[PDB]
Structure formats: C-alpha cells, structure tokens
Amino acid sequence: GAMGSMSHIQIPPGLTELLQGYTVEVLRQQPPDLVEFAVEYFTRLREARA
Amino acid sequence: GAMGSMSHIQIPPGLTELLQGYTVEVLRQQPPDLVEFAVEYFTRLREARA
C-alpha cells in the first residue's frame, strides 16, 4: 500500500463535498465577491450549530 | 443555453485560485476541521487588507 514518509499528501476525503457546497452556491447566486461570499457562506454554515 | 454554458456552467473567474489558495494549506497543514479552518482563513484575508 504505502511507500514511505518521504512524501504523503493524498487528496484528503470529504474535501469535495465541502468545496461543492460553496462552489455550487456561488453560481446559483453569482455573487460579486469571493472573499466576502466565502466568509459569509462558511461562517454561517458553522454557526448553524447550537 | 446562452448566459451560462462553458463546459462547467460559469464559475466566477478567480474563484479557482481562491479555493486553491485555501486547499494548498489544508493539504500541507491538515487541520482538525475544514469549516473552522476556512472561516479563519477567509476572515484573515479580508481583515488583513481593505
């Protein structure tokens, strides 16, 4: 399986669904800012808890 | 099909780099939570400049 500690990055799992949520939302609404729309989309998502 | 069709629909230019700028950090940093690691990453970006 593995090879060695010389190099180990491998595209982590779940990263696809995380970016999709943001990505798919950017097109559906087509916002003017990415930096803003990013913190606006990510923070809210998290805060959703409790 | 007219105001939205470029093989991938129409990803707002620059978004590719934004998602990339963060991902490169995740791969080499590997945080406990993606959402929490992002929220701070986007806030720092804006709060850092105008």
Added chain:
Amino acid sequence: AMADIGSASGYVPEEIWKKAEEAVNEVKRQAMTELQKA
C-alpha cells in the same frame, strides 16, 4: 511541462500545488452538475 506558460509563484511547495489544483478542478466540474439538474 504540459501547458504552464505562466507561473503562480508567491508561495506553496511543489507537490502541494499540483495536488491542490486538482481538488478545485474536481469540485468545480462537479458543482456544475448540481446546477445542470436545476
């Protein structure tokens, strides 16, 4: 080489750049499907 005429630079190692670029291309080509299906 392949088609990298320019150069991002600024930061980010090597293998870390090639990989991260794939992740965004994948999620980008994917989210578009979520749209194609309205």
